[PDB]
Amino acid sequence: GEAPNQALLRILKETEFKKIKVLGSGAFGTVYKGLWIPEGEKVKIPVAIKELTSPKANKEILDEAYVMASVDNPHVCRLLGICLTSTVQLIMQLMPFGCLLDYVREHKDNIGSQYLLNWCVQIAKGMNYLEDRRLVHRDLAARNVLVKTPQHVKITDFGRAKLVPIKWMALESILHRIYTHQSDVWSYGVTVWELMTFGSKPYDGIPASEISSILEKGERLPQPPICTIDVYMIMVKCWMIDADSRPKFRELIIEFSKMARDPQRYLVIQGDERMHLPSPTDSNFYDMDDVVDADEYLIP
């Protein structure tokens, strides 16, 4: 019927990696910055460690791990392994610059049109990949795109992915709990809005109950100051009522790539082109001995 999922789930020993500090605490548990020093491999791999105990919640993290261990794409966050301790810990790639949402807020004054449009293209590539794998994310948002470097982002959070975040959802989903790749497009639209507004809250003030009807009336998020009509129209097409009228991810990749070739023609930003964000060709950008990025460390 469907193809066998031959992904390898890697079980890692607790003693093979060390927690360094905390990166975030929530209801789910807590995420640590850490290092993974596998076997006798002569490599340190920077990792994020997500740890939880109540039986019906352990199933949800293992569900996330299932999906996260099954993806392999440059614009999606893969699971490196799990560690079975009293708690259960997901080991993931360290994405040193955090979520894109906070990144746009904290670095607004150095974010030019090239970065924004390239981020849009990369998220669309990620999502298109998830579509090839017949996977529906169901929670795409700026908060769930992570920054490996300012020039490289990746989609995460498979805690809702299958084969509630109201202000990012398609209408069909809010009212009928229907979810498709095209419902992910809607959320893509909202995500891009967040980026083009440098991290503004969508429908800030409106309570989620009112949102369903607001959308029913034909209201949509406003045209961000920096957005040419070319870019805004793309957002708006992602918010059509007819799911099939919305763009496909494959087209979103194309449209944003064209615009990324002449960025200042599609986003208008004061001081654009004389802005500097950290690069792997900078000083102090990176024990340091034998550090290897997860993306360059392959197989057991």
Ligand SMILES: COC1(CCN)CCN(c2nccc(Nc3cc4c(cn3)nc(C)n4C(C)C)n2)CC1
């Ligand atoms: C807590 O789980 C998440 C959100 C679920 N709603 C989903 C999994 N996620 C994740 N996925 C893959 C890699 C990764 N690494 C990662 C996450 C980081 C990070 C560095 N690296 N710095 C910060 C501040 N954070 C997050 C807590 C947002 N983190 C971490 C956040």
